Design a protein around this motif. Structure first.
Motif, PDB file in Angstrom:
ATOM      1  N   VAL A   1      44.845  36.807  35.978  1.00  0.00           N
ATOM      2  CA  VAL A   1      45.853  35.777  36.256  1.00  0.00           C
ATOM      3  C   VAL A   1      45.684  35.163  37.663  1.00  0.00           C
ATOM      4  CG1 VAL A   1      48.350  35.353  36.561  1.00  0.00           C
ATOM      5  CG2 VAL A   1      47.526  36.628  34.571  1.00  0.00           C
ATOM      6  N   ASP A   2      45.905  33.854  37.772  1.00  0.00           N
ATOM      7  CA  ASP A   2      45.692  33.100  39.020  1.00  0.00           C
ATOM      8  C   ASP A   2      44.233  33.085  39.507  1.00  0.00           C
ATOM      9  OD1 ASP A   2      48.383  32.218  39.124  1.00  0.00           O
ATOM     10  OD2 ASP A   2      49.022  33.989  40.259  1.00  0.00           O
ATOM     11  N   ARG A   3      43.309  33.320  38.576  1.00  0.00           N
ATOM     12  CA  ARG A   3      41.868  33.284  38.826  1.00  0.00           C
ATOM     13  C   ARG A   3      41.420  34.350  39.822  1.00  0.00           C
ATOM     14  NH1 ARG A   3      43.000  28.833  40.701  1.00  0.00           N
ATOM     15  NH2 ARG A   3      41.308  28.961  42.252  1.00  0.00           N
ATOM     16  N   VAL A   4      42.142  35.466  39.841  1.00  0.00           N
ATOM     17  CA  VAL A   4      41.715  36.625  40.616  1.00  0.00           C
ATOM     18  C   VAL A   4      40.403  37.172  40.054  1.00  0.00           C
ATOM     19  CG1 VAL A   4      42.159  39.023  41.162  1.00  0.00           C
ATOM     20  CG2 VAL A   4      43.985  37.345  41.332  1.00  0.00           C
ATOM     21  N   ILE A   5      39.456  37.434  40.947  1.00  0.00           N
ATOM     22  CA  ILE A   5      38.210  38.074  40.565  1.00  0.00           C
ATOM     23  C   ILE A   5      37.978  39.349  41.370  1.00  0.00           C
ATOM     24  CG2 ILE A   5      37.126  35.978  39.692  1.00  0.00           C
ATOM     25  CD1 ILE A   5      35.799  35.564  42.347  1.00  0.00           C
ATOM     26  N   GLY A   6      37.262  40.289  40.763  1.00  0.00           N
ATOM     27  CA  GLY A   6      36.921  41.537  41.416  1.00  0.00           C
ATOM     28  C   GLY A   6      35.710  42.191  40.768  1.00  0.00           C
ATOM     29  N   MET A   7      35.394  43.390  41.230  1.00  0.00           N
ATOM     30  CA  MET A   7      34.335  44.191  40.651  1.00  0.00           C
ATOM     31  C   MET A   7      34.872  44.944  39.438  1.00  0.00           C
ATOM     32  SD  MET A   7      32.119  43.165  42.678  1.00  0.00           S
ATOM     33  CE  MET A   7      31.723  42.705  44.374  1.00  0.00           C
ATOM     34  N   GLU A   8      34.049  45.015  38.395  1.00  0.00           N
ATOM     35  CA  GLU A   8      34.417  45.686  37.154  1.00  0.00           C
ATOM     36  C   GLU A   8      35.066  47.076  37.361  1.00  0.00           C
ATOM     37  OE1 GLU A   8      34.874  44.731  34.157  1.00  0.00           O
ATOM     38  OE2 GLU A   8      35.210  46.712  33.279  1.00  0.00           O
ATOM     39  N   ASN A   9      34.470  47.935  38.185  1.00  0.00           N
ATOM     40  CA  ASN A   9      35.010  49.288  38.331  1.00  0.00           C
ATOM     41  C   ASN A   9      36.293  49.355  39.159  1.00  0.00           C
ATOM     42  OD1 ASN A   9      33.893  49.054  40.887  1.00  0.00           O
ATOM     43  ND2 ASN A   9      32.405  50.760  40.664  1.00  0.00           N
ATOM     44  N   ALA A  10      36.712  48.221  39.731  1.00  0.00           N
ATOM     45  CA  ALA A  10      37.942  48.159  40.547  1.00  0.00           C
ATOM     46  C   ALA A  10      39.083  47.430  39.827  1.00  0.00           C
ATOM     47  CB  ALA A  10      37.671  47.509  41.921  1.00  0.00           C
ATOM     48  N   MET A  11      38.745  46.690  38.783  1.00  0.00           N
ATOM     49  CA  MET A  11      39.734  45.956  38.004  1.00  0.00           C
ATOM     50  C   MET A  11      40.368  46.876  36.964  1.00  0.00           C
ATOM     51  SD  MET A  11      39.669  43.130  39.509  1.00  0.00           S
ATOM     52  CE  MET A  11      40.570  41.929  38.516  1.00  0.00           C
TER      53      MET A  11
ATOM     54  N   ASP B   1      44.469  38.289  30.280  1.00  0.00           N
ATOM     55  CA  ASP B   1      45.922  38.289  30.520  1.00  0.00           C
ATOM     56  C   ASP B   1      46.387  39.588  31.172  1.00  0.00           C
ATOM     57  OD1 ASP B   1      46.358  35.694  29.311  1.00  0.00           O
ATOM     58  OD2 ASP B   1      45.950  36.704  27.395  1.00  0.00           O
ATOM     59  N   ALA B   2      46.169  39.648  32.479  1.00  0.00           N
ATOM     60  CA  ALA B   2      46.447  40.816  33.294  1.00  0.00           C
ATOM     61  C   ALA B   2      46.737  40.357  34.725  1.00  0.00           C
ATOM     62  CB  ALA B   2      45.258  41.774  33.272  1.00  0.00           C
ATOM     63  N   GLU B   3      47.900  40.741  35.247  1.00  0.00           N
ATOM     64  CA  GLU B   3      48.239  40.463  36.634  1.00  0.00           C
ATOM     65  C   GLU B   3      47.679  41.539  37.558  1.00  0.00           C
ATOM     66  OE1 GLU B   3      52.456  39.573  37.007  1.00  0.00           O
ATOM     67  OE2 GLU B   3      52.157  37.545  36.182  1.00  0.00           O
TER      68      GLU B   3
ATOM     69  N   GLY C   1      44.754  40.745  44.355  1.00  0.00           N
ATOM     70  CA  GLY C   1      43.417  40.388  44.770  1.00  0.00           C
ATOM     71  C   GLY C   1      43.436  39.370  45.877  1.00  0.00           C
ATOM     72  N   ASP C   2      42.443  39.444  46.758  1.00  0.00           N
ATOM     73  CA  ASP C   2      42.304  38.468  47.828  1.00  0.00           C
ATOM     74  C   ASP C   2      41.325  37.405  47.395  1.00  0.00           C
ATOM     75  OD1 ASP C   2      43.977  39.826  49.796  1.00  0.00           O
ATOM     76  OD2 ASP C   2      42.321  41.258  50.005  1.00  0.00           O
ATOM     77  N   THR C   3      40.395  37.770  46.525  1.00  0.00           N
ATOM     78  CA  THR C   3      39.344  36.834  46.150  1.00  0.00           C
ATOM     79  C   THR C   3      39.689  36.123  44.853  1.00  0.00           C
ATOM     80  OG1 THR C   3      37.808  38.506  47.007  1.00  0.00           O
ATOM     81  CG2 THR C   3      36.849  36.506  46.007  1.00  0.00           C
ATOM     82  N   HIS C   4      39.449  34.819  44.837  1.00  0.00           N
ATOM     83  CA  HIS C   4      39.732  33.998  43.670  1.00  0.00           C
ATOM     84  C   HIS C   4      38.529  33.143  43.330  1.00  0.00           C
ATOM     85  CE1 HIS C   4      43.634  35.134  45.360  1.00  0.00           C
ATOM     86  NE2 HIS C   4      44.017  35.196  44.085  1.00  0.00           N
ATOM     87  N   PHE C   5      38.385  32.849  42.049  1.00  0.00           N
ATOM     88  CA  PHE C   5      37.336  31.970  41.589  1.00  0.00           C
ATOM     89  C   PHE C   5      37.585  30.579  42.163  1.00  0.00           C
ATOM     90  CE2 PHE C   5      34.934  29.403  38.585  1.00  0.00           C
ATOM     91  CZ  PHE C   5      33.808  30.185  38.388  1.00  0.00           C
ATOM     92  N   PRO C   6      36.543  29.972  42.758  1.00  0.00           N
ATOM     93  CA  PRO C   6      36.555  28.620  43.336  1.00  0.00           C
ATOM     94  C   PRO C   6      37.337  27.601  42.503  1.00  0.00           C
ATOM     95  CG  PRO C   6      34.387  29.545  43.620  1.00  0.00           C
ATOM     96  CD  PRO C   6      35.240  30.630  42.957  1.00  0.00           C
TER      97      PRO C   6
END
Lengths: 159, 117
Positions: free
Chosen positions: A10-20, A116-118, A121-126
């Motif tokens: 949600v909100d285009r948050v991105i992360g590493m697979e093992n941290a999501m 569909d998961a809140e 995250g600090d990093t977001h997809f451009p």
């Protein structure tokens, strides 16, 4: 042809697979299918989180501080990373944040998984101007026995 | 080899508590997302709970408020604390570990939970 592939919370948050905080075997398989036999390009951090190369592909690690690993190709610029991929139909850019930003203006195709998961995250997809992109494929799936959240596969082609 | 080993399973009455553990061997535990699954005979394995490398948890609706997942990186162990158990929780529970998009992923051999009533 340069294409980006990413999993967006949600909100285009991105992360590493093992941290999501999700479990999505359908997305892993989606990822596997679209990157198979294609060269992939990734950043320092994504390389460190992934632990080993994606098999059967050429893996290009884009970083200012180059490493020593003998299985991948270490480049220091965007141009160098594209050349090291060679003359293939499609190049797959897989993250992380900065590298998505850098390869977007050069990108002609996006593979998105809208999960569909809140997630914090600090990093977001451009941010990408939706006027400049067209949806050619979308497929929604409910959460099920093996998949922790509902998710939407999307493919966008430029113009 | 077998990288993951579950224990703690067994027989309890309805409303009872149980504590499952899964000890990892030969891997760098801290870099793995861990998940618990369960499978009843014939039925397919279903996600129960996960815990990320940064301690974010998720538990599925059917066990919300009853089951709790945690990890202790020092012991190479993930835990499933189960409370207020019900007959429908009867299953073999399996621990799973995944590194990320390129794997590897490992599965345990599973531990039987039977709830009576």
């Amino acid at each position: 042809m340069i294409s980006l592939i990413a999993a967006l919370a949600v909100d285009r948050v991105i992360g590493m697979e093992n941290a999501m905080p999700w479990n999505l075997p359908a997305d892993l398989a989606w990822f596997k299918r679209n990157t198979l036999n294609k060269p992939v390009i990734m950043g320092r951090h994504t390389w460190e989180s992934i632990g080993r190369p994606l098999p059967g592909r050429k893996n290009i690690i884009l970083s200012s501080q180059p490493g020593t690993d003998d299985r991948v190709t270490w480049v220091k610029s965007v141009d160098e990373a594209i050349a090291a991929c060679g003359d293939v139909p499609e190049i797959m850019v897989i993250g992380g944040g900065r590298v998505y930003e850098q390869f977007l203006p050069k990108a002609q195709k996006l593979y998105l998984t809208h999960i569909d998961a809140e997630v914090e995250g600090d990093t977001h997809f451009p941010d990408y101007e939706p006027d400049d992109w067209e949806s050619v494929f979308s497929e929604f799936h409910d959460a099920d026995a093996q998949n922790s959240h509902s998710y939407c596969f999307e493919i966008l082609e430029r113009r | 080899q077998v990288q993951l080993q579950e224990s703690g399973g067994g027989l309890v009455q309805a409303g009872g508590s149980l504590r499952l553990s899964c000890k990892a061997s030969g891997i760098i535990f801290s870099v793995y997302k861990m998940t618990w699954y369960r499978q009843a005979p014939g039925k397919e394995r279903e996600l129960v709970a996960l815990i990320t490398t940064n301690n974010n948890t998720m538990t599925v609706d059917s066990v919300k408020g009853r089951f709790t997942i945690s990890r202790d990186n020092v012991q190479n162990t993930v835990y499933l604390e189960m409370n207020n158990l019900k007959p429908e929780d009867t299953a073999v529970y399996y621990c799973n570990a995944n590194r990320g998009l390129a794997g590897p992923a490992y599965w345990g051999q599973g531990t039987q939970v039977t709830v009576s009533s």
